[PDB]
Amino acid sequence: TFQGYNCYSSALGEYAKQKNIDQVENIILSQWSFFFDEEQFYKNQWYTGAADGPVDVVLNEDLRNFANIEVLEHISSESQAIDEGRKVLEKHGLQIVLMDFYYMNSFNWKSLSRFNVTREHDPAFAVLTQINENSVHIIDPYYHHEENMSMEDFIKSRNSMTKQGKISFNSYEIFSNGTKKSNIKELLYYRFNRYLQEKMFGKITQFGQVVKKQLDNKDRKWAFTGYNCLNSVVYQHQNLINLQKKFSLEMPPNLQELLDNWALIRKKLFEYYSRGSYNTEEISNLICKVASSEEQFAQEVLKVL
């Protein structure tokens, strides 16, 4: 399945790939973003990484602004959701749905030695491919997993209260109003220019300073949340490496090194959470160092691209 850089972008891109909808994948693969929300940090919601969620509104703006592609949110009800689903499958073949990940658990945490897989009501995305009498078929494109789910579990998952709001059978419809094609260099220039002008590297520094202040926080789950949140940043870095390879782009020479720096930050957050270490000072230092490295990298991308 199409990885994207977050659950929402993975779902849009998987839909786009299966239905050869032009430009959606390229606009996702060329995204360059960082956010930090101190209020979400202290409510242990998804507080950093590529984009606020679960819907990536900045990506929606990019799709409209560059390709004249709209993403329309539909809201439904218990009585109407499945019949509306059948009509969507007849007309478009797929439906992108908001789902409580509590009912999906698409990722094998035991592969990374985490056996205490704490259950959480978190909104995620699935691509619905088939409606049966007592079951549906879904793809979780972010975790490259597909399953048959009972009709009961499907309906429950689409109607549950999560830590990040109330799901009411929400579905996302991508429609092109007249697609403008972009060169990958144009899409990257706009993103890197926006990254610098909005001082997104500054939000990395803020994250670093907040990590330093958790020295004596007895609660460590911010570090697991941070670990999960930063997978989006690793994916954007890998996506840009893949774009560099495909289109023979000129990049500053330290792109792989930056990906490695984010992978190390993630490793140390995971080790801290798992009581492997006691090193918030070290983690905060690495975050503040990568903030400056990312600012410098972005300035150099605008020069050499």
Ligand X SMILES: *C(=O)c1ccc(O)cc1
Which residues are near ligand X by CB under 6 A? 7, 54, 101, 122, 124-125, 142
CA distances from 132 to 23, 83, 93, 255 (A): 32, 12, 14, 46
* Least CB distance to ligand X at residue 293 (A): 27
Residue 139: helix, strand or coil by DSSP? strand
Q: Pick between residue 49 and residue 85 the one whose CB is nearest to ligand X.
A: 49
Give Dmax over CA atoms of the chain in angstroms: 57
Q: Pick between residue 142 and residue 297 the one whose CB is nearest to ligand X.
A: 142
Q: Pick between residue 161 and residue 304 the one whose CB is nearest to ligand X.
A: 161
Q: Pick between residue 56 and residue 295 the one whose CB is nearest to ligand X.
A: 56
* Least CB distance to ligand X at residue 37 (A): 16
* Least CB distance to ligand X at residue 92 (A): 21
Nearest residue to the partner ligand X, using Cβ: 7
* Least CB distance to ligand X at residue 11 (A): 8
- CA–CA dist 196, 209 (Å, integer): 20
* Least CB distance to ligand X at residue 46 (A): 8
CB 208, CB 287: distance < 8 Å: yes
- CA–CA dist 145, 185 (Å, integer): 32
Classify the C-alpha dihedral 77-83-85-87 as positive or negative: negative
Q: Which residues of 52-86 are buried (b: 16+ CB within 10 A; e: fewer)?
A: bbbbbeebbebbeebbebebeebebeeeebbeebe
* Least CB distance to ligand X at residue 6 (A): 7
Q: Pick between residue 11 and residue 286 the one whose CB is nearest to ligand X.
A: 11
Query: With 0-12 CB in 10 A as exposed, 13-18 as middle and 19+ as buried, what is 110?
Result: exposed
Cβ-based neighbour number of residue 221 at 10 Å: 12
- CA–CA dist 70, 11 (Å, integer): 15
Q: Pick between residue 145 and residue 185 the one whose CB is nearest to ligand X.
A: 145
Q: Pick between residue 122 and residue 295 the one whose CB is nearest to ligand X.
A: 122
* Least CB distance to ligand X at residue 107 (A): 7
Classify the C-alpha dihedral 128-129-132-135 as positive or negative: negative
* Least CB distance to ligand X at residue 257 (A): 27
Listing DSSP states for 180-225 in one string gives PP--HHHHHHHHHHHHHHTTHHHHHHHHHHHHHTTTT-S--HHHHH
Q: Bridge partners of 146?
A: 139
125: left (phi over 0), alpha (psi -120 to 50) or beta: beta
Q: Pick between residue 7 and residue 67 the one whose CB is nearest to ligand X.
A: 7
